[PDB]
Design a protein around this ligand. Structure first.
Ligand SMILES: CC(C)N1c2cc(Nc3nccc(-c4ccccc4)n3)ccc2N(C)C(=O)[C@H]1C
Length: 124
């Protein structure tokens, strides 16, 4: 049931290491990574382990912080907005598949609040 994980290395993509991208890796992701509620988002959803054969039949653009981290470390992104879009996909996937008030949603919401606080001001 588990599809292959999203791509994290692509030598053909045009890469950059902007100040903003470095900050997203060194400050934003690494602080989120240590949050008490980070653990469900640190790797792709393992639908086999969770016995959720429906998950990837609903969520067609999966994303997780482990993937974002590998992408940042591989300079996969051209700008910070591309990386922020991946974070937003991760959060939105959770809000789509689950319902308001579910425990996993409360965890995603806590992470998102921290994420939005940290990216409110980015380097120049
Ligand atoms: C809804 C839940 C299945 N959920 C999820 C689960 C995990 N991992 C995990 N492992 C053991 C127990 C639990 C668990 C069990 C009952 C209540 C709350 C958590 N969750 C990792 C990520 C996700 N995300 C991001 C989702 O959107 C969906 C797929």
């Amino acid at each position: 049931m588990n599809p292959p994980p999203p791509e994290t290395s692509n030598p053909n993509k045009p890469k950059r290491q902007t100040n903003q991208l470095q900050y997203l890796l060194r400050v934003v992701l690494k602080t989120l990574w240590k949050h008490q509620f980070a653990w469900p988002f640190q790797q792709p959803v393992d639908a086999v382990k969770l016995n959720l054969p429906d998950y990837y039949k609903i969520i067609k653009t999966p994303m997780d912080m482990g993937t974002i981290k590998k992408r940042l470390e591989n300079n996969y992104y051209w700008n910070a907005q591309e990386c922020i879009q991946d974070f937003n996909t991760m959060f939105t996937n959770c809000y789509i598949y689950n319902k308001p008030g579910d425990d996993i949603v409360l965890m995603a919401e806590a992470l998102e609040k921290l994420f939005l606080q940290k990216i409110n001001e980015l380097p120049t």
